Amino acid sequence: MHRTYSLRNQRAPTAAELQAPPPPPSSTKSKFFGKASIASSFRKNAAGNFGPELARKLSQLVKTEKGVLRAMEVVASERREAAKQLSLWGADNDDDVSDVTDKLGVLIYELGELQDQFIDKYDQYRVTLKSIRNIEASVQPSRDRKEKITDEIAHLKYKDPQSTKIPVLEQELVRAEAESLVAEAQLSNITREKLKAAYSYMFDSLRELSEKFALIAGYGKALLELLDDSPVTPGEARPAYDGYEASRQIIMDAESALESWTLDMAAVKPT
Amino acid sequence: MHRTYSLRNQRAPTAAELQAPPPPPSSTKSKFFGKASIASSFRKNAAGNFGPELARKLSQLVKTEKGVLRAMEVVASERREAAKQLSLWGADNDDDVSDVTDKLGVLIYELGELQDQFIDKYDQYRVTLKSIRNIEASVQPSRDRKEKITDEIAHLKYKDPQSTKIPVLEQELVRAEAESLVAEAQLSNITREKLKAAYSYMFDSLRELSEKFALIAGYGKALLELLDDSPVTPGEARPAYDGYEASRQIIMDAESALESWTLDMAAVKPT
Amino acid sequence: MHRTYSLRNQRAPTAAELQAPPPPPSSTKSKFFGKASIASSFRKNAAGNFGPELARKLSQLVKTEKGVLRAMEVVASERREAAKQLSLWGADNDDDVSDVTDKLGVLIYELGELQDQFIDKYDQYRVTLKSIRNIEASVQPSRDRKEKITDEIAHLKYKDPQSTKIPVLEQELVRAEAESLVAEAQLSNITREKLKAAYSYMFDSLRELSEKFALIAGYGKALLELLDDSPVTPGEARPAYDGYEASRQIIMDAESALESWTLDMAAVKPT
């Protein structure tokens, strides 16, 4: 992150914040738990309660992303209702506002739909995180077997070196040594390859959602241009709205840029 | 939106979907209400229960966005925990994975922080939506007075034209006519100006969040390049990690592009 | 401070830590309040209980440094006892150890004495912090008078513009305006000059204590050179100690460098 050289928690303002000062904190700071009700919070402790020690963190990790999915499902679905209600209010308004508002509802509807595709790809990233969780949890019992083996041979050797079980326990240590070694190496291999692929796919989904979000946001700015802000005095009639086809053409250009999106092209060019 | 010429609900695939087929639907389709618990749903009906008829839709609208804010608050805060837990797991892994993972946790932390600023600006857009709700709700009683006036004069005229209250009720109709006319005109004025300003600011916040999201996503892709996917065979040691400063420099370029973001420049260029 | 680009609290190791790994955390983590008993903690809240609002932070600040002084008084005095007890143990040991140990006790005694001078200068810095506290606390009642004045004139003007007290209250606002302005300007002046002088003197005391600490520490390292670590086998006598004058001369050089310390010279040369 970006932080200032001060004991204060507040960081240095961004160049974007220089032009527009940051708004006051949101008035939705509920005086409650604030973390996806109670069942999710109790579930969070349950992952580390009765799971393998090695995979306890991963058992939380994959399921924690389910909390991301469930919360984002509400965001996508409930914001979808906002587009429903927004375009509905356009009726009890003048024609110019009605056309702009319901068109904005279409654009927000697209915002929600793209979000839903993002949650689907997010689920796929969660699924492969579950897969690496599964193999790591399968590795753990071998570690259990190995430490049990060295514990027994150490205890038996301490008791007496003439025990007949130590000749076979020494080979059992070598047994488990090669046993654990082969899949410890592939555990690093599969973790590296799967994490790289999963997060490359996840960031690909993030880039897809991000650029689509930006394209609709900018074209909504162009859509908002057909919104007269003239302060008409009372007693005088309004000229009739005429930008019906102009807003219609704006959507067509939006759809044209929507259906012509390939990963080869990218307006965002990191340095 | 984009839909195909078919009675089927499924739409035509996007060019992005042509390269990568869409993933299967998420496994988080809970068999429950699925809309921000029950209190929000019961609250949604309450807005239209005991409110002014004109502002019933707006009373829902501004408060519905509070449901967006509350749900997004969970998303921002609970995904923030995912960055916490992800970087924590980097300990019980090789050094290369540890450096990449905790750096990814930093980038996701920035993702959450930018989300929080988005919710703050979203609250401001909700607040001005509350303001237009307030004035429209203040307009409603005049409509109540006007229809009551014409109802009384019509009923009195039907009963008898010689009633002494009709001479003053006729002027009362003109009274309320000019009364309602002046602020009906400004109601259209303030609704148009405030909606345009609020949604221009909201789309400005959306563009800000979108481009910042994309910048961090792309630089995370560059960060992921320092992740060897070589399938090392068991029994052979690994060369030591060396991309400590390379990943450090990647963040510096990310911060440099982060602190040098102005609305004058925009990589996204709509056609 | 120096922190790493990770959500982990642990920072990047220093170059000094690279040569010598950091030791495990101290075993003195008492399961108690741990902040200078209870009276100091209760006193800390008392400073902000019944004090002027403007000087509440400074009233804590100057007195908080008394907590530094009281705690450092214990450190200086109780470590002074450690030098007493250390040199005492030198009796029931061989002559070589006895000479080295009691000489080390002398050096630690000097360590304590220099600490005491540091606490004295620390008290002076605390005293001038009390002085700026006093003047700022004296400024506060004028702010009280000014806001009371504007409150009364606003309330009286709201009640009626014909009130006879408003003609004199308007001049009273100008009265307090020039009143507050003259010492607000000097408040900034005196705060800047006094804080600069106090912390320059405080850092001068810190530099004095620091370099004296280092000089005694290094000469103690030279003193420790007269300490044979040979593993003498049992049954063989030891050669008699002879470095009596060598350790005596080491102290003389230490005292010679001690009495020849001027602020013009400084081994520490910041870049």
Author numbering:
A (entry chain B), B (entry chain A), C (entry chain C): 1 to 271
Quote the original article:
We isolated MCC–eisosomes from S. cerevisiae using a gentle purification procedure, preserving a lattice of untagged Pil1/Lsp1 structural proteins bound to a presumably intact plasma membrane bilayer in a near-native state, observable as a two-layer density in the protein tubule. Although MCC–eisosomes have been shown to have a furrow-like half-pipe structure in vivo, our isolated eisosome tubules seem to be closed, continuous helices of Pil1/Lsp1 proteins. Using a symmetry expansion and density subtraction strategy, we could refine our structures to a resolution of around 3.2 Å, which allowed us to build models of the paralogues Pil1 and Lsp1. Two novel structured regions of the protein were visible in our maps: (1) a folded N terminus (Nt) that forms lattice contact sites with the Nt of a neighbouring dimer, followed by (2) an Nt amphipathic helix (AH; residues 39–48) buried within the lipid density of the cytoplasmic leaflet of the bilayer that runs parallel to the BAR-domain helices of each Pil1/Lsp1 monomer.
